[PDB]
Amino acid sequence: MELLQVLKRGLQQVSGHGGLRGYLRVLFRANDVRVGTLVGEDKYGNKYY
Amino acid sequence: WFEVLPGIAVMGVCLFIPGMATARIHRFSNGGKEKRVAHYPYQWYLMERDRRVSGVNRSYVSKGLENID
Amino acid sequence: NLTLNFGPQHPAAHGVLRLVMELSGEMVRKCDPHIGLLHRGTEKLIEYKTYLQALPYFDRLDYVSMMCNEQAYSLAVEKLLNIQPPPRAQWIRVLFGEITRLLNHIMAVTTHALDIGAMTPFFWMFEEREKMFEFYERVSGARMHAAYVRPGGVHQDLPLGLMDDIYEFSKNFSLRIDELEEMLTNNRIWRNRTVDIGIVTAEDALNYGFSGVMLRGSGIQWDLRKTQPYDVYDQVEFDVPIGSRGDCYDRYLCRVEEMRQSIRIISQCLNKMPPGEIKVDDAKVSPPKRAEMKTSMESLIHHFKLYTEGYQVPPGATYTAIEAPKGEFGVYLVSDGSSRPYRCKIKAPGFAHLAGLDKMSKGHMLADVVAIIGTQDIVFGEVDR
Amino acid sequence: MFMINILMLIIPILLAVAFLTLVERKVLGYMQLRKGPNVVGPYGLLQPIADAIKLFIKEPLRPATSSASMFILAPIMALGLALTMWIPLPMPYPLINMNLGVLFMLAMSSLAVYSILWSGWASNSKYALIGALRAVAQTISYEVTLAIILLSVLLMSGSFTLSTLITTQEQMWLILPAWPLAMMWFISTLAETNRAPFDLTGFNVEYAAGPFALFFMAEYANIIMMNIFTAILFLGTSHNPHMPELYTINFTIKSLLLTMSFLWIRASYPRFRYDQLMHLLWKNFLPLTLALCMWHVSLPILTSGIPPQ
Amino acid sequence: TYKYVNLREPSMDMKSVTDRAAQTLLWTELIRGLGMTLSYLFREPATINYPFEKGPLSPRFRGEHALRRYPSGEERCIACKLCEAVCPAQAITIEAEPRADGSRRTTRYDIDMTKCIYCGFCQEACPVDAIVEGPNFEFSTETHEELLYNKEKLLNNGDKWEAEIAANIQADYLYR
Amino acid sequence: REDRFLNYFANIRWFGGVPLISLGKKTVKQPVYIVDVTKGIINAIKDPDARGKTFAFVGPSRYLLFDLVQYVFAVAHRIGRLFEISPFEPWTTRDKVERIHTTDKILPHLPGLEDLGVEATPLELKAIEVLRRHRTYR
Amino acid sequence: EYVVAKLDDLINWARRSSLWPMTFGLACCAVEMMHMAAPRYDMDRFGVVFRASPRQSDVMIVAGTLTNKMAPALRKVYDQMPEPRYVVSMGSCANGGGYYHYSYSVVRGCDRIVPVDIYVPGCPPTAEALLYGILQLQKKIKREKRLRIWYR
Amino acid sequence: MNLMLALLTNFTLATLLVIIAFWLPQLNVLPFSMKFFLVAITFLLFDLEIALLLPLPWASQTANLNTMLTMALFLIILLAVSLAYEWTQKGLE
Ligand SMILES: CCCCCCCCCCCCCCCCCC(=O)OC[C@H](COP(=O)(O)OCCN)OC(=O)CCCCCCCCCCCCCCCCC
Ligand code: SF4
Ligand code: SF4
């Protein structure tokens, strides 16, 4: 019964960052879908995670 | 390991159609009844008879006990 | 008889080596290949260069060896110049000289197992091979082709690190060689694909002038690795494999045990390295340090002149050879007496190891012939000798 | 509306394998520690729809050294019979209730060797003239290894038709009395459909972008068909009259696993070096086939368990 | 010394043949071994998403050429020609001239980026440490007519960045 | 090699090979060979003194016959268009069919090719090259 | 037209979405491309499949060093390619023939034989700037098929 | 009456697609070997005697069985003895 114990980890990991627009916009470039925790500062809008 | 699961749910779903389609045609063509099969020539003789006496021209309809009372 | 030239075909492997096949219906019985796809003008080209300037054209002679080539050159030059290299430097030439054998003996099996047609042992081992090019970039200058060994010993010292990395690397490698043991040894079909193929075992297996494996693993015990020294290389302990009969499957099983020797030697070499210097001290051959070529007067005149011209080599012919990981490596370096050398004739393997394909092939199929070639481990550009 | 049953079986089965070359690689991907199609999909699922456009843009140059009436004739039959063989196949209801159809599958699959002899011969020299012969010569040897052990289970199931084959396997999973036959079924069917261990398989190299795609599309059509044919025969499913939907749920999902097996065996093994390849049939396979052919005759007799028909 | 591998006579008795008979007949080989070593599929794919992710390097990595200069601009090059005489491909060509202030500088300065075989000896031959192999693999133009670098690429290319260059020399100059 | 007039012939695989127009009257014009064309320019590009004195291009020996159309099927043994096909790059059943059958061997007082020498090419030697059909050996 | 020119944002997109390359392994620049095939910088499934038969190619790659004994064999394979082709040569010995450049028997350039579009420099380009050259190539396809017959 | 109207759609679909494939969207304007013969003859021999082997499942719902038992096993014998003399010489096959 492991379809829900790791799904609770993945539920906030998918839904709980940006919602539906922040997920689908970053989806349409690659499979780079896991959001980074720590952020960088430089420079324009390219926050090096 | 995750990305292969949308790969499975495309071609495998593409086989779900004709088994669903055909079982929603012969069931639909005979009005919620299965199609009368005929493998032996004695079996066909019923359909060759009963179509001529069903009501007008059909093999998927019945008469019942109340026909001749 | 049909005269097909199955070669120039870019059928994986190495789209080169175009040859003829006068096959007698199904068996071949006559094979006369053509070489010369890359002649490149190598041996004529070196006649205008100096000693330090000509050095990377030994490096690009293989595809694989980066520190086993230039090992056969500096040791072919330091004998002429009456120099022993300093002792810290000799422990590195054995370390990288026993790390390139963990590049040929990975490529010599996978690329053979790709002509055959297996897919997955090609990707299962090169993904582990990436953990090793980070070394080459960290120490010398580049991905592969490194002008790193000099005639004055090692170029420079390897930085902080690379001792808890190699010990980290080498402690997790024998599990990966235990993978291919399950992949090929206990399997039957690959055993059935290669048994009793290329049975060449007589004294014409040595009259053809073969070097190692496609030697001793077929019989005659001899090698250049403990009858002839290089550096501190006899002070380590190891054994040399011998197979049973004279076919490819008993020259294949050299290479599984050969990789099980290089792990021991690395785990034996790390315990014995002393701190010391890098270069030869007398500085008529080694350049002086960068912090020295900006202060004193004696440093620049033995810096600025040492790059306009090269060294001063005495005359008299010389010759040596070492263990390339597929064979001997003959260099007959003719010296004249100036900064520019005279004739530099090289002997590489493949001259013997592929002229004896005539004897080895016949009496057999056509599908046998591609399975023959990936056992000798023949690399072109290296047959340019 | 018999015609709309036709178009809702031919068209929805083309996308069943046009979206499989994707699945071919990703299953190949996640063995080699690598990912699927990454930039176009995003999950890959937009890759083959663009690649299908390319092979009809790119120019199909014709050989001047060949005829034209023969050269396009082999792709005519390539979609002809290799799609016709789908027709009397139940799920749980076949399109045609043939009174005998197991002979009908072999009758159509025996003309599969009659297509490869065209394209190599009418085209060109050597490779396309001698190399295309041997491939018939291996695939003529795998009907006798196919049809005999096929006949050994009709002795126990009961007859030729396929509609009775479901009822007779409603409690069994008939691999259990025929697990020796299960190897020589699946090995032989693997070898006929020209796949990775049993390969020697010039009958493709001359085809440009136009008609190469057919004899890549028809060859794939065979391979899920030998999956769906083994599916109704060995691993029979349960049947419900009042719920026909539950049949097809656990029908294709079992054939889809065996579809992966052709992708899975391909990622393990080398070739067989042609002289061995027929030598392992006559010397090795065929004497066991005759022995088990004698086995399934005496045992239903020495059970008083003859299947009724 | 020795080792005799693949040299072992068979068992040849009553019971041990049943281990070699069950092997061929029922295939306890080739599935327990080769069907399990492939799967082994559940490991993480170690792939770099190249336009987004990038791999490791070293501080001594070679690449694009560039020229440095002192604090406020001086042309650190002194045109002492030593990088020319050790270039194996002779990709250097320099014509010098006394500039009117008096100190000598360059007029033409060329690197045949086609011919350049990247022996990097130019980096290890300049006494005043002028030319530097800058660590940026940004390349791939569309003509042969473009990659021949003149001087006014190289001073500009040496001044698209310097803090990239000036930190790698300062972390590596103690070794060499 | 890849002109239109000579490739107008043998691209006529059809249910009838008709000449223009079932008559051997005017055929043919002067087919000068393409090496002579590019050789005339490079001699004139620093000739000198060749401005105003316009020049004419001599063809082969000498006028030509009706045999040319029979010469096609005897030895042949009977670029930014679009993504699929161009809708109109036709054979043009219009004034295309008459622009070639109007020979006009014009005034020989133009100097115009042999003086801008040297250009001398037959037809029978260069005909093997451009024609290419299904036999290719015999 | 807005209707017709919308179409080539599919077709000139589709050709830059599926490239089936040939590789000519001749010298040390062949080995580094194999590491691009090795799944670190996994070359497959970023738009581009692995090796393929010589018939079905779009993008040929010359790597290494050309000799005069290979100059006929290069042109014959170059003829057999279909029409929307491109030539991209990696390696510093395919841009002037590196050094070996003054040798008596090396093709000077790999440009005096075939017309090549993208030049990656370097003894081995490190399988790091080479994916950058390929994304340059798909960036080069901004061409059009409509408004070519629609103009002339 | 659709059998025969069942495959007519299938064959008109294949011959349609080649015209969009080979046709209009293109518009470009043996030595003998004996060992590779005897296996075809050998196959056709065992191809016949499986068609006589073919009528078995209808040959069980029958009369007195030991006629049909002992005779049907005899065809397998003749199919097997034919192997053994041929097993004495197969060639490089
Ligand atoms: C007394 C009671 C009544 C009788 C009951 C007795 C039951 C016996 C059941 C036997 C039935 C199965 C055996 C059928 C024959 C199998 C074929 C075979 O064994 O050939 C062996 C093959 C040939 O080489 P060999 O003869 O072994 O010579 C080399 C010796 N070192 O050498 C090999 O080993 C290679 C193996 C064949 C190569 C192909 C392998 C490809 C992988 C296929 C995987 C199959 C997965 C399982 C099947 C799928 C399930 C549907
Ligand atoms: S690097 Fe040295 S040799 Fe080269 S131009 Fe500068 S000062 Fe002169
Ligand atoms: S970078 Fe290499 S080729 Fe260029 S000048 Fe320096 S050493 Fe010579």
Ligand code: SF4
């Ligand atoms: S110089 Fe460059 S192209 Fe030539 S072999 Fe070396 S890496 Fe390959």
